[PDB]
Design a protein around this ligand. Structure first.
Ligand SMILES: Cc1cc2nc3c(=O)[nH]c(=O)nc-3n(C[C@H](O)[C@H](O)[C@H](O)COP(=O)(O)O)c2cc1C
Ligand SMILES: CCc1oc(=O)c(Cc2c(O)c(CC=C(C)C)c(O)c(C(C)=O)c2O)c(O)c1C
Ligand SMILES: O=C(O)c1cc(=O)[nH]c(=O)[nH]1
Length: 350
């Protein structure tokens, strides 16, 4: 996969994963790694971040890889092609990636039928501690962003353990302004009303996924709206449009969202701030630059109940999943935690 262009390599990775051609992971999850949050049991706290399986093609292969939960998407209401290629760039010297896909999506109807073909299989997986998240986006030309998200709630909500209102892609014009207070309250009120209108066994948790580039005011406002409306959780963070000092990759000045190691601590600090602003009462899924057990535990101690990764998988391969989990269990023991749950937010209680 490293030898092809990055997008072609990704498509080959998705196809290979979907076929199950990867040997089943050998790491057996210990009880120490179980987390109960968002109304569900998670066998382990390490998920695949949105973007790897944009269209829901490889869910079962990803569980076989050892992920404790899978998030697909972002999915847009209508199919759309995204930006012209190339739109994904490797920064090997930084263990980073820059992408500007622009919400390439098979669309709600195609993804709906894909998930329906395995809906009862997923119900059993969820009951066994392996939940499914669905990340919702908006079409490029849509005139009414809230209605795009409402359509996603109605169509894929009934197939999801949790939904993500992705208002933080750097690659759709105007999207991140949906993170402002008034716009976000109106958008999330509509999303939650649509969610509440689904039948009980088809009613997912709703989370908001936020950028790492927010001002202090932006974060205060998001925290306020999340508590006012009863939003079920936050995903922290998407990719960054910043370019931290010190990037070495030749492609560092490509337009797009930066992921991987240069994002890691910006993400951890955003988790830390959002946990404090919500008094530790709002579950956080922490994501950005996780490639080791230490990376995972730092985000958990900062306030994350669960973590996700994507970019590290494309540098270290499938073994990184078991590596993170084994290192995490060892660090929890070394630091005197009974399990993941005991470590959530621990830095704030020092
Ligand atoms: C190529 C690529 C595509 C992505 N697509 C999406 C997406 O469609 N929706 C979304 O919410 N996040 C998307 N992300 C963001 C990731 O879910 C994650 O938030 C971010 O990459 C940081 O995690 P990482 O450093 O482990 O990759 C994408 C990231 C990458 C690298
Ligand atoms: C869009 C971001 C992006 O997404 C990808 O999916 C890949 C492919 C890829 C990979 O998925 C895995 C993980 C292997 C699986 C079978 C799932 C890899 O181990 C590698 C390598 C070199 O080891 C790999 O290149 C990318 O290169 C990039 C830049
Ligand atoms: O371009 C996309 O589709 C995309 C990239 C990214 O980093 N984040 C996101 O939410 N969408």
């Amino acid at each position: 996969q490293g030898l092809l262009d990055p997008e072609s390599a990704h498509r080959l990775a998705v196809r290979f994963t979907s076929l199950g051609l990867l040997p089943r992971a050998r790491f057996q999850d210990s009880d120490m790694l179980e987390v109960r949050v968002l109304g569900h049991k998670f066998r382990n706290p390490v998920g695949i971040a949105a973007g790897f399986d944009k269209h829901g093609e490889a869910v079962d292969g990803l569980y076989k890889m050892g992920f404790g939960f899978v998030e697909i998407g972002s999915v847009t209401p209508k199919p759309q092609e995204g930006n012209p290629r190339p739109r994904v760039f490797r920064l090997p010297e930084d263990q980073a990636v820059i992408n500007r896909y622009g919400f390439n999506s098979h669309g709600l109807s195609v993804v709906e039928h894909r998930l329906r073909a395995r809906q009862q299989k997923q119900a059993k997986l969820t009951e066994d501690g392996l939940p499914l998240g669905v990340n919702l986006g908006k079409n490029k030309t849509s005139v009414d962003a809230a209605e795009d998200y409402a359509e996603g709630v109605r169509v894929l909500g009934p197939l999801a353990d949790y939904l993500v209102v992705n208002v933080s892609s750097p690659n759709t014009a105007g999207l991140r302004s949906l993170q402002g207070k008034a716009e976000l309250r109106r958008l999330l009120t509509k999303v939650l009303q649509e969610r509440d209108g689904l039948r009980r066994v088809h009613r997912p948790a709703v989370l908001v996924k936020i950028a790492p580039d927010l001002t202090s005011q932006d974060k205060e406002d998001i925290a306020s709206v999340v508590k006012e409306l009863g939003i079920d959780g936050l995903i922290v963070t998407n990719t960054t449009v910043s370019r931290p000092a010190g990037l070495q990759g030749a492609l560092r000045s490509e337009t797009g969202g930066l992921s991987g190691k240069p994002l890691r601590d910006l993400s951890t600090q955003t988790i830390r701030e959002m946990y404090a602003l919500t008094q530790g009462r709002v579950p956080i899924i922490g994501v950005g630059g996780v490639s080791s057990g230490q990376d995972a535990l730092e985000k958990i101690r900062a306030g994350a109940s669960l973590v996700q990764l994507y970019t590290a998988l494309t540098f270290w391969g499938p073994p990184v999943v078991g590596k993170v989990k084994r290192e995490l269990e060892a660090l929890l023991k070394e630091q005197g935690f009974g399990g993941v749950t005991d470590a959530i937010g621990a830095d704030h209680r020092r």
